[PDB]
Symmetry: D3
Subunit: 230 residues, 6 copies
């Protein structure tokens, strides 16, 4: 159907959970979904569709970086009529009060990428998570009573950032964590009148290096229950 | 105490409602606050402090534009130890599905200003409303059962914008409304580890010109009840 | 007539003196104008029209920051057919040879705002004071024999500037003082084939903190006599 | 050893061929390398190391987009002491005289990404392929007598580009093709005093949609023979 | 003494008239200066020093474009202790009310160059002519009673400008004429606490193609008399 | 024929060698060309046309800076139907391993100018030397067996650069040398479907100050022999 997806309209659920690691997407499908069926493996992206508590749900990799997820998210909303995309995964803590293993729900994401400026006449576009998705994630977190921090994220184009001062600047403004996709995903959902959100588990702290399964499994519970709520 | 405020630490409540029109700030104090006392009138900004349901609350003008509100908000958080600032007022609808008299609660605000780029190493800072404030405003709206749209706002530096295409672009990305302060307020609250939010009543639609009191009074109810919740 | 002005065409003189502080605009009207009449008080902006030496002249506030004065100046030139706008007020000295109480006449104004780039295809627009207005101000200064420094000003979007190095950089390039409106006013006057100028009294020095009435009154004399000359 | 590579120093040859599709990297290893051994599969990136004509050579995926390849290339040069990275793969033709199935060797690559500006003080960095690698690729092409076009490439951050006019602009300046990694790879090689190059087979034309194996196999021959020459 | 000047401190007068055409600088020296002596001809720049009405004055070419004049002007102020540089020459009319053969005195100059942003922390630097020089030029014009237009100029980096819309935009903002050096010269004079100005004769109109000696000679009279006044 | 060239179509050879110093262009014509005839001296640019080994070849100055060479190169390709332009001259070494008197052949050139961003929708244009010209220059160097370094150059708009850190940054990325024209020339050649290249002799090192004829003559040999090859 698309240059990066062999599936056809209908193969994907209206709600898709995405993570960077394709092998993680596979593990998520085998571990949390019932009757998971591989609907797309172009570039070994591991796109699966199954059910959770009887409801259709898909999980698929999205690569690393804004350019990668922008391709996948746009095709999903446009061609496969997906309605909600929830990014699930890991991130690097920024704020000094955020620690490894913490779970973070993004209200929005800043970025050092030029993509949003290109689509927004060189102005400041606020890459904002869909309010419904933020609410569903927070409520799921409250209902499951799992501690989660809600706040700004940052999507960097440079995992290895030459601008060593940025990290401290972001800590001063209290950015919670860094990843590489949210800032790109959110504006695309808006353009298609669809929804997007992001929830991550801190795998490390960038201002000082500091069980990882429990945190990851708790995050998956929140994302999954939230997907049902939506 | 400051170049723009004659009051001293303690004269302002920890929660301050702000609007552009100083005469509106005065009207709000006389109409909704009990025992309102003028605590600052430098530049006729009309800064009052009184109580609502027994709790201390201040209301004050903030001028028009990001540069103006940045001055007031920074002094309030820094010098007067204010904790929460809620911008209340009017805005221009962008989205075709948003209409005059509608009430909008900002999750965040985009901007064509350079202020956030200056404070954020020329990168994209997501001017995001404090999640607690967004929640308090939405809950107040739900409890009072007043219909309100939640979504992105846009703070323009140019009321009379030469870039006539921007309006349609924003409608495509579903920006809800335009005002001139939010994008500046939000990042300042973050820097001071404080809180900020914005709620407005659409006074007109910018893509087509289309009782105004009821809407304004309903908005004031939401802001006020939210202030108590916080 | 406009969203920020209740007056109608003809209520404003062709020459308008503007300052940020609305209460100062009121004081100027009562102190220097004869038969001053309030022609606009939307947002308590204090717009007055009277006469000086028999000639019609208006005085009105313009708020703080480029976005604010851009609104007022554009409406005045466009709707009220005003021909000349002279910004009168205070500023912060930059240059080491400029001192508090000094009077400065701007030849032009630099800025860290994005407004001029937006209206000038992202190029460098030289926010220049109208040569006629600069001349009228200097001649008035010479005729009244009041010492005044003529040179570049800087209109900042950030009263509290995070870029602490800018101040010293501007001192090296000999910027005379900082305010928050000129860079916005000048290009608007050009667009409407009208005129604009700026004259200020240094209320403080930003590189080192260092009677204020005499200086302010002397500045008002220059502006007023210049207004007559024009 | 690294967050994206489980291999240790020595597992990778000093020359690494990279492509976006991990499944293609696997196919290349099984088809052209002798005794190929999987040295890294973190994120299913398919990193293999074997020999070609007796010389050690590695092949591995690099994901889509500059942020992705920047991670992989920097770790390879820095941690695994790789000396030469040759990007092999597909691209979209831009120039009207370039056609589907054509083989293109990049002298350099332009981009709409902000990465190079971030690492080069906001100036214009010329993402240039290592001259040795360009020469090796061209000579291999000449020796194998396989027609190949040499010229500028373009690495876009947006596969689905909102700026529809860019394509025609690039055709006027004669950019040969578009991909999503070269502009990022080249500057990284320079920083590490290492080498990088790119060769692609046009899978389609972006200005008009227009056997694919022969072209791909011919490209692989050039890259492989060039790798030996280096 | 410098890479572009073989003269030594003292060979140049404190006032230097500069034009792009080296052959014009030579003609000016032979035609208006008494006892003109060649003090520098590196790169055939034709730097002369003589006297006008008994006062020392130099004339020299400066090449075309901001980068060229920046080299010459900086060396002159820094090494040769020159105090005033007056650019004399030709320009292209922009404004519809400006015509070929008209004489224009620049109050300032806009530009599409990046030089001023590089020296001014990426902000808007107002390339302003020294007020003393503008005054001297205008007074000379008034005393000689030669009609001259005073206003903004524009220094383009592109004689052949791809942005065909810029011309009309500048006409709307009433830029008087275009040349290629002023925007660079003015900020350099400021940095060295020196002076600079520009006066040109329109050789053609860029919005519509439309004796040339009289205009040029009249301009030279103004510049020369102004040089004496300074 | 053009505002900067009095010659007519046919007066210039299809191959033109250009240098900044007009007196050097004259010396090159008298020293290496047979029957050199002055075909253009507007602005004393010294444009000559003669023959080398029987083939028509022109040499002419181009001034200093991108704006200057852009004028000359565009007129030459457009009006005089020139096919190949080779910039010959001097440059300042950047890389620590490059020394004074070394000969450098540019594969491409970076820049701090805004010209390429203006012509390339504000994106990163890779100012690349024509591959044919790079090859001809390298082969000539190999055939004459003259040691020459091939790599990136940098065209600065500021000979006297305020950004003192740039030099070290460029050394880290291994830029070979700095000049002031290449970045402008290369994109123009592309637009006209023509060719351009650059070869220079290091006259000094910018990171530490460190016979000059031999190097210059060797460079001229390479350029000349290359011109014949093309
Ligand atoms: N500390 C960290 N920093 C950055 F920039 N990204 C982090 C991260 N931890 C996880 N991620 C997520 C985002 C990318 O897809 C991928 C990068 O390894 O995994
Ligand atoms: N349609 C509209 N457009 C913009 F730009 N701002 C609007 C508005 N309606 C209200 N506002 C708010 C924001 C400023 O403080 C002030 C500007 O009049 O009131
Ligand atoms: N030191 C100073 N710095 C800045 F930025 N602005 C100054 C000032 N002194 C006076 N002003 C003028 C301009 C604004 O309207 C307002 C800001 O208080 O008053
Ligand atoms: N027409 C085309 N346009 C763009 F932008 N990239 C193209 C392409 N054909 C192949 N590619 C390469 C680059 C990415 O890794 C990936 C994107 O599908 O494959
Ligand atoms: N119409 C025109 N446009 C531009 F851009 N520059 C003009 C000009 N007429 C004269 N000049 C001056 C400036 C350069 O030094 C040189 C360019 O030919 O002469
Ligand atoms: N060290 C150096 N730095 C820079 F920026 N340019 C250099 C140079 N050596 C020679 N050039 C060439 C380029 C200009 O045309 C002219 C500048 O003098 O000569």
């Amino acid at each position: 159907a698309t240059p990066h997806n062999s599936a056809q309209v209908g193969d994907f659920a209206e709600t898709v959970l995405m993570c960077g690691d394709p092998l993680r997407a596979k593990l998520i499908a085998e571990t949390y979904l019932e009757n998971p069926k591989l609907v797309n493996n172009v570039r070994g992206i591991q796109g699966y569709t199954g059910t959770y508590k009887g409801k259709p749900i898909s999980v698929m990799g999205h690569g690393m970086g804004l350019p990668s997820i922008c391709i996948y998210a746009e095709e999903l909303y446009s061609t496969y009529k997906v309605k909600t995309i929830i990014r699930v995964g890991t991130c690097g803590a920024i704020d000094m009060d955020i620690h490894t293993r913490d779970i973070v729900i993004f209200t929005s994401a800043g970025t050092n990428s030029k993509i949003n400026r290109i689509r927004f006449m060189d102005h400041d576009y606020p890459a904002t998570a869909s309010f419904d998705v933020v609410c569903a994630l927070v409520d799921a977190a409250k209902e499951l009573n799992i501690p989660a921090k809600v706040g700004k994220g940052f999507s960097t184009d440079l995992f290895y950032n030459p601008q060593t001062e940025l990290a401290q600047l972001m800590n001063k403004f209290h950015f919670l964590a860094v990843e590489m996709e949210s800032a790109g995903l959110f504006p695309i959902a808006d353009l298609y009148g669809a929804r997007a959100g992001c929830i991550c588990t801190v795998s490390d702290h960038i201002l000082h290096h500091e069980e990882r399964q429990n945190s990851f499994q708790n995050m998956m519970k929140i994302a999954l229950e939230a997907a049902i709520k939506l």
